[PDB]
Write a protein that binds this DNA or RNA. Structure first.
Ligand code: AMP
Ligand code: NA
Length: 645
DNA sequence: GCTGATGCGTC
DNA sequence: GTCGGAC
DNA sequence: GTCCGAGACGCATCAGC
């Protein structure tokens, strides 16, 4: 028999044979170490196609030898507990995880934290960790499904003292870990596998696997490499087609619990016959590509006619109306928010004609003040309860701004152009002021008329404009292009928006790709009244890899053991390295918000809360400025007031 | 019962 | 959400 | 262009008090 120890499993080898090169036998549980070894081979390469090939080899062995374990192996590869709509949450972050490592090793929680921060990866701490659990019985090797079952067991633990119950399961896993298993179990619980391979690549590997090694064969499978009879060119074309069948199906039914059973019983080629878009099953939403100016929009949309629509500052709400009356609402991430919007459920009868029997609407939920009849800031929207039983208790009303229709009366509109989908939206749905409204739109290509429209959108309390083609490449097929729309935000424009010069007062050690250097920084404004620096926000994006290495080499010389007395951070995350205030960086953000932690400009707008920056990004260093010339807290307050108008 | 840390989702 | 890097 | 992996702040949960 095949007694290959999993420690030697190599899914990246040339001429991989699904049966003979697997490190487990027919009918045996897929060892979790087989998955870990696959992760190792995947993270040491940078080409996606090489990663897909490697994962595909594992999946072919699983199909050939252990079909029941295909589903848990996929979820482990994605670092997911299940379909997004089932609302499964581990309830385990770095806090719970690091606490579990400390007890499993006898170390102080502070020591494990420091080491994890230094290495930038909890997985490397759990692997180099000396285990204190002097167990008197060697545990069996972990299995892929067994580890997946324990992860779901962790999720289901709720109530008081549940944390200690979660830790016990985690500790039990680590005591049974061998080789690199502990590394990836810790990474999975942290939520940071660091593979460089995610949803799109897992689908590509899956489609390739079931195409090369069709499931459902009599063992041993007579057909283990269905590409052998094809030329390289025909093989590539054939695999791309099968990949699209899986991608487009998944985009309409992103639920492996529904796809994999069909896949194993009927094959990939017949998958669309048994799995298709349906109300009650969320689908992947169309996303937008950032554009930096109106000129870029015409370039990307040369020739093709397009429309512009207000980009409202709310939350995406995918509204499903099933044949029968059942209504469900999903988020951008396929999460079920039905219980959050009882006021929207009771509103559906008002927005549709008597002929509408089912639909899937793409809308933006926006906080709405019925007294003043005006859009309220996104911040007000986030104060709604996540499970509102009685609509009579809701305090923040919402108005739905519909901008697309994906399904109508039992028929999918995914292959229709926007012009038709938009037309079906207007002909079949009814507007109500402040409750359900079509997105304010404009059809033109006159640059002058677009800039005016962009301005009016900002005056009407919007982030900017969405630009979408009407007929050329204007379908809702996410597998063909997920970012088929263009977003033009006010703060994308060169020289427009909020730009601040802030003092660097602290550095945070980086994680993953940022390990061994600073991944983020603590910034502050200058309060000229008390002559103190007040933390305003953290910063962790906007610089190249080369700029960030220079920030590391430069700021390392400013590291202090204790903070200066004139530096107030109050409730902000204490930096790993206090920095002598000196460096002044130019920062851009989308908005300013009243913060519950940051002290910047406290007392200049509200007595208790300071001000922070929404989505800050690094622009450039200001070598011509010292901390005393940084943006003042007074200027921060003035900036915040210019918003509230 | 209350507070604050933690987890996770929204942008 | 933003951003940059490797392909 | 694709794909992937490197902020503020709100509710909800829960450990510690
Ligand atoms: O920045 P981003 O990529 O999340 O932007 C896309 C999001 O913008 C919201 N939005 C608001 N108004 C619209 C219209 N008219 N069309 C499309 N999207 C819109 C959505 O929430 C979307 O996810
Ligand atoms: Na590169």
């Amino acid at each position: 028999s095949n007694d290959m120890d999993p420690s030697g499993y190599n899914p990246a080898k040339n001429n991989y044979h699904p049966v003979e090169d697997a490190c487990w036998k027919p009918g045996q549980k897929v060892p979790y170490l087989a998955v870990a070894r696959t992760f190792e081979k995947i993270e040491e390469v940078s080409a996606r196609l090489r990663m897909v090939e490697t994962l595909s080899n594992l999946l072919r062995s699983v199909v050939a030898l252990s079909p029941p374990d295909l589903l848990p192996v996929l979820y482990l590869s994605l670092n997911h507990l299940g379909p997004p709509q089932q609302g499964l949450e581990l309830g385990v972050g770095d806090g719970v995880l690091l606490k579990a490592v400390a007890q499993a090793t006898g170390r102080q929680l502070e020591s494990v934290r420091a080491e994890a921060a230094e290495k930038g990866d909890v997985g490397l701490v759990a692997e180099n960790s000396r285990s204190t659990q002097r167990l008197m019985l060697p545990p069996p090797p972990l299995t892929a499904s067994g580890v997946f079952s324990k992860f779901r067991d962790i999720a289901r633990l709720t109530g008081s003292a549940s944390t200690a119950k979660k830790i016990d399961i985690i500790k039990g896993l680590f005591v049974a870990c061998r080789h690199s298993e502990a590394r990836f179990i810790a990474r999975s619980l942290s939520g940071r596998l660091r593979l460089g391979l995610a949803e799109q690549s897992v689908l590509a590997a899956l489609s390739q696997a079931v195409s090369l090694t069709p499931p459902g064969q009599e063992f041993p499978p007579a057909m283990v490499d269905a590409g052998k009879g094809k030329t390289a060119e025909a093989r590539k074309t054939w695999l791309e087609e099968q990949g699209m069948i899986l991608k487009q199906t998944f985009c309409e039914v992103p639920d492996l619990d529904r796809i994999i059973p069909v896949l194993l019983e009927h094959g990939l080629e017949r998958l669309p016959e048994h799995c298709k878009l349906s109300p009650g099953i969320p689908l992947k939403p169309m996303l937008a590509h950032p554009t930096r100016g109106i000129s870029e929009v015409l370039k990307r949309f040369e020739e093709a006619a397009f429309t512009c629509e207000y980009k409202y500052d709310g939350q995406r709400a995918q509204i499903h109306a099933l044949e029968g009356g059942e209504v469900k609402i999903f988020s951008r991430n396929q999460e079920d928010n039905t219980g959050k919007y009882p006021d929207i459920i009771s509103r559906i009868p008002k927005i549709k004609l008597p002929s509408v029997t089912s639909f899937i609407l793409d809308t933006e939920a926006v906080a709405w003040d019925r007294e003043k009849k005006q859009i309220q800031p996104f911040q007000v929207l986030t104060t709604r309860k996540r499970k509102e039983v009685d609509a009579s208790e809701i305090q923040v009303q919402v108005c739905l701004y519909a901008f697309d229709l994906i399904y109508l009366n039992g028929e999918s509109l995914v292959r229709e152009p926007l012009s038709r989908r938009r037309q079906l939206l207007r002909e079949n749905f009814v507007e109500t002021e402040g409750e359900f409204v079509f997105a304010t739109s404009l059809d033109t290509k006159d640059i002058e008329q677009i800039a005016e429209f962009l301005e009016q959108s900002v005056k009407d309390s919007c982030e900017g404009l969405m630009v979408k083609t009407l007929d050329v490449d204007a379908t809702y097929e996410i597998a063909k292009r997920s970012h088929n729309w263009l977003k033009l935000k006010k703060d994308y424009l060169d020289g427009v928006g909020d730009t601040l010069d802030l003092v660097v007062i602290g550095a945070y050690l980086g994680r993953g790709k940022r390990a061994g250097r600073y991944g983020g920084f603590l910034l502050a404004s200058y309060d000229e009244d008390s002559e103190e620096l007040q933390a305003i926000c953290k910063l962790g994006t906007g610089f190249s890899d080369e700029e960030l290495e220079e920030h590391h080499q430069s700021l390392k010389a400013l590291v202090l053991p204790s903070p200066r007395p004139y530096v107030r951070i109050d409730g902000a995350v204490i930096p790993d390295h206090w920095l002598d205030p000196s460096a002044v960086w130019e920062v851009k953000c989308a908005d300013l918000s009243l913060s519950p932690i940051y002290p910047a400009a406290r007392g200049l707008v509200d007595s208790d809360k300071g001000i922070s920056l929404r989505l800050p990004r690094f622009i450039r260093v200001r070598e011509d400025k010292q901390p005393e010339q940084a943006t003042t807290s007074a200027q921060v307050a003035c900036l915040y007031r210019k918003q509230s108008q």
